[PDB]
Design a protein around this ligand. Sequence first.
Ligand SMILES: [Cl-]
Ligand SMILES: [Cl-]
Ligand SMILES: [Cl-]
Ligand SMILES: [Cl-]
Ligand SMILES: [Zn+2]
Ligand SMILES: [Zn+2]
Ligand SMILES: [Zn+2]
Ligand SMILES: [Zn+2]
Ligand SMILES: [Zn+2]
Lengths: 21, 21, 21, 21, 21, 21, 30, 30, 30, 30, 30, 30
Amino acid sequence: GIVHQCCHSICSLYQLENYCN
Amino acid sequence: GIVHQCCHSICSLYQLENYCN
Amino acid sequence: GIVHQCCHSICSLYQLENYCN
Amino acid sequence: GIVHQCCHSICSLYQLENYCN
Amino acid sequence: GIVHQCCHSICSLYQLENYCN
Amino acid sequence: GIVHQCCHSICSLYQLENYCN
Amino acid sequence: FVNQHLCGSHLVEALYLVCGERGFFYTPKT
Amino acid sequence: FVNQHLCGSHLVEALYLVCGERGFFYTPKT
Amino acid sequence: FVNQHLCGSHLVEALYLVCGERGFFYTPKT
Amino acid sequence: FVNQHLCGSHLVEALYLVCGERGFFYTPKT
Amino acid sequence: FVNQHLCGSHLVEALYLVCGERGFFYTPKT
Amino acid sequence: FVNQHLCGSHLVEALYLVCGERGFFYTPKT
Ligand SMILES: [Cl-]
Ligand SMILES: [Cl-]
Ligand SMILES: [Cl-]
Ligand SMILES: [Cl-]
Ligand SMILES: [Zn+2]
Ligand SMILES: [Zn+2]
Ligand SMILES: [Zn+2]
Ligand SMILES: [Zn+2]
Ligand SMILES: [Zn+2]
């Protein structure tokens, strides 16, 4: 999940893009 | 969409909840 | 106080409503 | 209210402080 | 400035990056 | 750096003013 | 609850709050 | 860390939305 | 300090910052 | 502390900006 | 990425996100 | 947790308000 990956370690804009529809 | 319903127009809390899973 | 209750545990919108005037 | 003083009009830092406890 | 380029006008991600160090 | 000082201890508006240009 | 136009990231934070554990879906140009 | 100070920021933004016209008082103390 | 119209949650975050430990009161429709 | 709940708030605001017209689903679970 | 006017603190949060570790400079009245 | 990354977000929003026309540089490093 986005919370488990991005709240544990910093997710860059590029990494966050994976969670877009 | 939610943008036209709640940003362009005003949404009550109930209407905002329509976008909850 | 709102800080001691809501920063210790998550307060839902309903719980936050108690702190409104 | 503060909304008309600082949102409708512009408030200086000093005027914003009028709403501090 | 960035305000007139991205707030007054619309900036693409690339243009926003012009303000990165 | 602003992160090391202000994320360790709370920086007031007055303290944050040091990091302005 | 506030009775104002909710736009941009403000509409997203409202959904975040309002929906809580239910989660939400933000699809603007649907 | 400043966990309390940051949480406070979210709290007041949430009260803004939840309380609406009712307004609210934020006393970091007590 | 910024010299712009402060509205919605932006006015609340400004009060949060500006008032600090003093706390503040947000009552719009007074 | 509510570290997870606060982080979530930033995450959804970041998705708003990153996803744009594409929209996104936020499921605090999973 | 979002395609809207970015103003006030919204432009700053966008720079924060977009620039990442690179950092950024916000100088409006240049 | 990402305590530093989240704090940074609040810091830049606070600098936006505090600095105003003066602008500011945000270097997560140093
Ligand atoms: Cl319309
Ligand atoms: Cl007016
Ligand atoms: Cl212009
Ligand atoms: Cl936070
Ligand atoms: Zn419309
Ligand atoms: Zn007015
Ligand atoms: Zn202009
Ligand atoms: Zn935060
Ligand atoms: Zn805004």
